[PDB]
Structure formats: structure tokens, C-alpha cells
Structure 1
Amino acid sequence: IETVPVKLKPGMDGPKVKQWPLTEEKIKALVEICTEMEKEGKISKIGPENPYNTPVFAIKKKDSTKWRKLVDFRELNKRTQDFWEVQLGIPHPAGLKKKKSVTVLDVGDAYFSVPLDEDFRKYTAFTIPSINNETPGIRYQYNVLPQGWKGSPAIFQSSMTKILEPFKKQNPDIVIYQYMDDLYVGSDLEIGQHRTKIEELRQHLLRWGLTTPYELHPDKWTVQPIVLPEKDSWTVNDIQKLVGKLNWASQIYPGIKVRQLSKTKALTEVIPLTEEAELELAENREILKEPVHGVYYDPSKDLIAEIQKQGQGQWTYQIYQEPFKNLKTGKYARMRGAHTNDVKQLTEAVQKITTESIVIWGKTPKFKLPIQKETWETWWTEYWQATWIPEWEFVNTPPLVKLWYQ
């Protein structure tokens, strides 16, 4: 099979990203994985004439007791795919977000059966690192379509469309969308009917040579409503926090009636709700009930996700592209009795938000994560169960607005 030629964006040079230091455990797992890969043709050792590099990591995908290699191809994706969303794009179905159940099948192993353009392999270099700078580091490049690269499913989509065509014929109501290594498969069936259909698709893929080794429900109540507290008795400081919350929402919603509620008592003194005050409160709860105006998804600008830690395992998030023009807000919360911690919750939340973002727009967002950069860079792999990796950056000034999104 001939190779699809890959000529990346003019003037752009290849990735030159440093490799993170790793635990001995993970270095050993990487050496094992890569020795089998070299033995099978998928990667080859390289020399000093190849200056590029692309980070690698060891994770455990889908709660397995066996390791898995994860290549961070973000830099190479920006440097090639920004002309391979154009030349070889995969169109994103606008109806996948509307099916009542959506399952995510991993179909990554597929790419390993297709060779990669020889002139391109240089740019898939990666270093398995040594401890204490003791040995040079082991240098590989790919000879087959690598998982994690956005060009692989692009190149493979002709094959994927052909393999899937008999199923798509037998099931014309089902939606199938390929994001990098996963088919997202949506249906309006009962959950058991849906599971039956998903296993039929598994066996259809299998009897065509695609090995494949947890459902979403995107009737998920898009941008969530904020509610004012409801109380039998209203104190001075209750009126104060209510006023302050309602003034912050003047940035998102325009028509919050304020003055009737703004009219040197002690904080704990209970002030009775005026007729004009309860009038303004009702008008404001109503003007909050409805969704926002002018909020439309622009497909030229990037998506932005912000997360806030709420305590007791709760986390709120907003996804937007213009401030206060939220495209989607929601709330994540880990298991009630499970042994979890902050960074575990942050990682599962980032993953959940990214999957939602794929289902809805076919793009991932850039995260503004509430966490020390070096902490995240050290611990994010320990719970990362996904094969893609979103862009991110770190917040260090806190929201003195914390409750306003709870």
C-alpha cells in the first residue's frame, strides 16, 4: 500500500519539545512497549541527524493492569494538522449531540496497519529518557501512522468509511463520528438495545480486522441556570450576598432590577423583605430563568474552559469563547465513598469536559486549570485514561467569586 504524502505547513519546522523526567517504573514500561514495537516494524531507532522530539508517557488505559504508551503530539498537530483540517478534514455531525445515548469505542489499533510517508517519519521522533542523565536516551521514530497524531485518522478515513458502510446501511438512524482514535456512536434506543447495537458494531469491526478492547447522554441540559438562595428569613448579610451576586450577573444578563433591593444595620439583623424588594427578586429570578442572548458558537475562534474547585469533591466548569457568553456550563462530582483526591478529580473533570466538547463541537477546549503548574505536570498522567490531550494553562489568581457559580 502506497503512503499518503505529508507536506506540513510552509515555513513550519518540526517539533522540538523537551521530554519530561519519568519514574523508573514508567521508563521500564516504555522500554518494554517500544521493544515490541520495534520488533514489529512500527518504530525504528534514529541517529543524531534527526533533531526533533515529541514527549512520551506511560499511562494505564481503561483501568487495565498493563501499561500503555501515550505520545503527546500537540506540537506536531498544530504544525501539520492546521493544514490537515483543511486538506483532509473529517466533518463533524451536528446531530451527535442530540442522541439520547452515546458510546465511545476505541479504534486506535487500526492506524498501526498503515505505513507513514517516509519523508515525514523524521518528525515523529521521541526519546525514552534515562534516570539522572546517565545514558543518552533511546531515540525512535514511527514507520506507521501513530496514535495521537491528528493525521492518522485523516489518512485512514477512506478505509474507515468503507469498513463502516455496511453497518451504516443496516442502521441509518445511528450516528458515528471518528475523533482521532475513537468512534462516538449515538442512538435513541433503550440502554439495553443500545448495548446490543454497540456489540454488533464491535463484531462488525472485528470481522473486518479492527480489534477494539461508559456512555454519555447529551440531552445534558445545556448552559445551566444560576439560582438565587431561597430562605424563610432574610438577614442583612443575606441581602448583601444576594445584591452582590445579582450585580455580577449584570455582566451576563442585562435586565436585573437592583435598586429596589439595595434600599448601617448590623450584619445579623433580620431585615424584612419589602414589597418592592420581593418584586425585584421575582423579576430577577424570572429574567434568570431564560437563557442568554447573542451566544452562538463561532467555529473560527478556539474554545475555552474554566474550572472552579467547590469543596467536597464538587467542581464547576464553564465553556465559552467570549467572556460571559457561555456556550456550556456544568458541574462534576466524584464518587461518594471512593478514595479520591484533588488532582484525581481535576483530571477526571478535564477528561469529562473534553469528551463533551468533542461530542458537541468536534474540537477540544483550552483549559485554565486551578492548580500549580509543576504539580500538574508531575501528576496528570497517574489518572489520565484518554488517548488525546487537550491544551492547557494554569491559573494562579483565585476567583473571589467562588460561590457565584456553585
Structure 2
Amino acid sequence: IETVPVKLKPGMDGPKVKQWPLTEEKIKALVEICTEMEKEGKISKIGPENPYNTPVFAIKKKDSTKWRKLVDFRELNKRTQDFWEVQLGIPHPAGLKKKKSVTVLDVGDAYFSVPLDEDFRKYTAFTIPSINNETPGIRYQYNVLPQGWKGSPAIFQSSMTKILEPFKKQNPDIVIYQYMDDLYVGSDLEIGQHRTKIEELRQHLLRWGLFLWMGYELHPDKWTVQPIVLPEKDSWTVNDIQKLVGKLNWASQIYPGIKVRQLSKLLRGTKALTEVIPLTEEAELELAENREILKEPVHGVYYDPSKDLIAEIQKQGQGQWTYQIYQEPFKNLKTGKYARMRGAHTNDVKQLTEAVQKITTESIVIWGKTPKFKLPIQKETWETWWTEYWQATWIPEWEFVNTPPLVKLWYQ
């Protein structure tokens, strides 16, 4: 006797989501994968009486040579009524984001033993499609807790605790978090230390019964929200003052105090763009006080668990991407940049996907609730290829920008 019944919200029915076309390579890979999952009772073939469906696809895991099955439960999770504590105080771990280092461990394959509630199982239906629709797709549903479902960790949570307390006692300082298939553990420990620190949890966990041999190390030292900086120059041309006046005007949206009157006054006139204009003292002071306000932080910038987190991304060129997270326009909760040379400098789509993952991971760690992305890319282009580079167990939500912001440069 091992399952916990579960339902949906009032008027919320199972998912009926279209499977998208897959490559012959991925299908053959999902077939093989899925046969074995059947041999071990993990999932079973279902009849035509099950109408529901969730998309599924295949990937090559982080630092991997083997294919892996990925199921997009985004819709099923929005249909899942999260389970809650019975004492009102409910905390996300702020400490993890405050800790020096955060190591992510994939604890998904643990759920493969724990059974799923019968009256819910029909809801995890999915199809391996055929090529050119010649044959009817091959359908299954889960018998055990599925990777990708968020109501899945909530169940194993008051069970993992048991698996984690033999560590929490021992290392009272460390913080441990959980978002989906992964465990987030951070420590204010020396790297050599913190690193070896994980094998202790990575090992003591197998004793509890328990892929998991790869390395991804993560750190928070940065500015929460990178500060806006103005340039320092000895000679300023009309074009420089203009770009400056531009950047500042944009910043006064965020920092009310930004005045650019004396900086504007020199702009009066109709001089060649490339002409050097000498700075006055009236506008130096204007520039001085402006820099100060820029050093200091936005006032009353509160987070609020009731609204959603929005991540914006800008393609700056040469594999450089800036990005911002927020819930309120002009109220950045965090900024940053991904200028990495690990992804393709020959593939935009590939670079953006990576950008989105890293920004997602950063989000979970700071708030525990991934961001709603605004992509600098035509809808069709993104869905056609993003899956070909996804390496994570979860998937955020995302809209699409179609008009280039003027603010691109103002960030880098």
C-alpha cells in the first residue's frame, strides 16, 4: 500500500496536448527507452478510452552520450493543485541564494520505485508518434511517479526528508533545496571542501537506496542587480553626449532623480555628430550627481510571491546576452549576462537556449519559482529547434518579442 490520491482544481480536466513531430532518430530512441520502462513496470500501454495526452521528447543529457526521455508537463502542472503544509508559516530557502556555492544533484530516478495514484494515472498519457502518420502512435501512461511532474516531488518530499535528516543533523549549517528532479545544496565552504562535501550526500544517499556522475558547479557572487555605469572620457563628441543623454533619460525611469538639463543644454545647437564638445561645470555636476544616484540602489524594491517573475533577454552580439528578471517594469530584482564560449558562436538558437536554462536555474535558487521568459526570437524559429539543445528536466514558460527594444545598448 503506497500511494496518495490526488486531483485537479474545480473545473480543471486532464491535459489534451498535441504531440509535436519528432525526428526518426528521436523516435527510435524513445521506442527503445520506453520498451524497457515497460519491462520494469514503470509505464504501461493504454487503450483508446484514454483521451488525455502530454508532449514527450528525447534529449542527450548534460555531459552525456546517451539519449534520455523528457516529458513536457507544463500543462499538467498548471492543472495540479499543489499540496500544502498544515501550519501557516511556509518558507522557501533564502539561505541557498545567500550561500557561497550551490551544487545541483539530479534525484529524479529515485521516484521510479514509488507508485502513482490509480485515479490520476490516466493523466500522464503520452504518445510516441509515427513518421508521416503512417501508423497509429504508441501510447502509455505512468504507473510510478514521473520525472517532470511537479506534484511528484511534493509527494516524495516528506520522504526525502527522512533521506536527508542523516545529513542535516551532521552538517547543521548547510542548506538543501529541491526543485523538481534536482536537489540544490549550498555551503559557505571552501571549494575543495564544499566539493568533497557533496560526495558525502551523494554517497550517504545511495545507502538510502539509489544519471549521477557529472559536474556542474554554481556561484552567486555578482551584483544582485548590476548597476548602470556611464562612460568616462576626456573629450566628448556630440554623438557621445547624445548617447549619454539617451541612456540617462532611460535610467530616470528607474531612478527619478536623474536630471539631464545641463547635459541637454550643450546639445542645443546643430553641430556635426562627430564634433568634439567641451564639458561645462554646470553639466559636470549634473553628471557627477547622476553617477552617485547610479551607485545607490532602487528604493522599496520588494519581491511578491503573488506575481510572476519575468525574464527578458537581449542578443548583444558575439555570443553575448544580457538579461533582466523582475515582476514590475523598472523594478529589477536581478540583472546579469551570459557571454559564455561554451555554446555555438555559430548558432543563435543554441546560445539562447543555454541562456534560458542558466537564467532559469538562477531564478529557482533565488525565489524557487522559475521566470516567464520574453524571447528575442520569432515564435516559429524557436519551437522548431529549442528542443534540440534542451538539457534540463524542467521547462519554463515563454512569450516572444517581435519589436527590437531601444534598450539593447543601454545594457552593454
**What TM-score comes out, normalization by structure 1 length?**
0.96
Change (3 A) 1:5 1:213: farther
Alpha carbons of structure 1 residues 89 and 40: separation in structure 2 relative to 1, 3 Å: farther
Please state which structure has a larger fraction of its residues in helix.
Answer: 1
Task: Find the residue that maps to 2:110 and give its secondary structure.
Answer: helix
Q: Which range is displaced more, 231-240 or 88-97?
A: 88-97
Q: Give me the identity figure in percent.
A: 99
Q: 1:267 to 1:211 in 2, by over 3 A?
A: closer
The change in CA–CA distance for 1:351 and 1:272 in structure 2 (over 3 A counts) is same
Q: Judging changes above 3 Å, is the alpha-carbon distance between structure 1 residues 393 and 89 closer, same or farther for their aligned structure 2 residues?
A: farther
CA distance in structure 2 between the aligned counterparts of 1:150 and 1:3, rounded to whole angstroms: 16
Matched residues in 1 for 2:19 and 2:342: separation? 37
**Alpha carbons 1:90, 1:154 under 8 Å: kept:** no
State the shift of 1:83 in Å: 5.8
1:339 to 1:63, Cα distance in 2 relative to 1, 3 A:
farther
CA gap of 1:122–1:89, structure 2 versus 1, over 3 A, is: farther
Distance (whole Å) between structure 2 residues aligned to residue 70 and residue 390 of structure 1: 14
Contact 1:102–1:216, Cα closer than 8 Å, also in 2: yes
**Deviation sequence 1:75-104 (CA, Å, 0-9, x none):** 000001456699999842111111111100
What do the CA deviations read for 1:132-163 (whole angstroms, capped 9, x no partner)? 11111111100000000001110101210001
Conserved in 2, the CA contact under 8 Å of 1:205 and 1:211? Answer: no
Q: Which moved more, 1:91-100 or 1:52-61?
A: 91-100
1:144-196 CA-partner distances (Å, limit 9, x unpaired): 00000001110101210001111111101111111111110000111110111
TM-score (norm 2): 0.95
Q: Work out whether residues 318 and 345 of structure 2, in 8 Å CA contact, stay in contact via their aligned partners in 1.
A: no
Contact 1:107 1:212 in 2 (8 A): no
Q: In the TM superposition, what are the counterparts of 1:126-205 in structure 2 within 5 Å?
A: 126-205=126-205
- Between the aligned partners of 1:180 and 1:85, the Cα distance in structure 2 is 18
Change in 2 beyond 3 A, CA 1:203/1:83: closer
- Could you tell me whether the CA contact under 8 Å between 2:252 and 2:259 is conserved in 1? no
Q: Is this contact kept in 1: 2:344–2:351, CA < 8 A?
A: no
Native 8 Å contact 2:54 2:126 kept in 1: yes
**Alpha-carbon deviations, 1:278-309, whole Å to 9, x = none?**
11011101111111112110100010000000
1:86/1:312 Cα in 2 relative to 1: closer, same or farther (>3 Å)? farther
Residue 151 and residue 166 in structure 1: after superposition, are their counterparts in 2 closer, same or farther (change >3 A)?
Answer: same
Q: How far apart are the structure 1 equivalents of 2:136 and 2:88?
A: 37
| 1:109–1:211 Cα contact (<8 Å) kept | no
Give the deviation of 1:321 after TM superposition: 0.4
- For 1:26-59, what per-residue CA distance to the aligned partner results, in whole angstroms no more than 9, with x for missing partners? 0110111000001111111111111101000101
CA shift at 1:233, angstroms? 0.8
Return the offset for 1:219: 2.8
The CA deviation at 1:231 is 1.3
1:321 & 1:42 partners in 2: Cα distance? 40
Q: Structure 1 runs of 4+ off > 4 angstroms?
A: 82-91, 210-213, 336-340
Partners in 2 of 1:93 and 1:401 — Cα distance?
Answer: 33
Cα deviation, residue 340, structure 1: 4.9
8 Å CA contact 1:343–1:380 kept in 2: the answer is yes
After superposition, the C-alpha distances for 1:243-274 in whole angstroms (9 at most, x for unaligned) are: 11111111111001211111111111111001
Further displaced range: 201-210 or 136-145 = 201-210
Assess, with a 3 A threshold, how the Cα gap between structure 1 residues 90 and 99 changes in structure 2: closer, same or farther.
same
What CA distance in whole angstroms lies between the structure 2 residues aligned with 1:182 and 1:351? Answer: 14
- CA spacing shift, 1:88–1:347, aligned 2, 3 Å: farther
Partners of 2:344 and 2:350 within 8 A in 1:
no
**88-97 or 127-136: bigger deviation:** 88-97
Where in structure 2 are there 5+ consecutive unaligned residues? none
Q: Distance in 2 between matches of 1:219 and 1:281?
A: 29
Residue 254 of structure 1: SS of its match in structure 2?
coil
1:339 Cα deviation from its structure 2 partner = 5.5
Change (3 A) 1:382 1:325: same
**In 2, Cα distance between equivalents of 1:186 and 1:64:** 25
Q: 1:335 deviation in Å?
A: 1.2
Structure 2 CA distance for partners of 1:85 and 1:132, relative to 1, 3 Å:
farther
CA positional deviation for 1:394? 1.1
SS at match of 1:326: coil
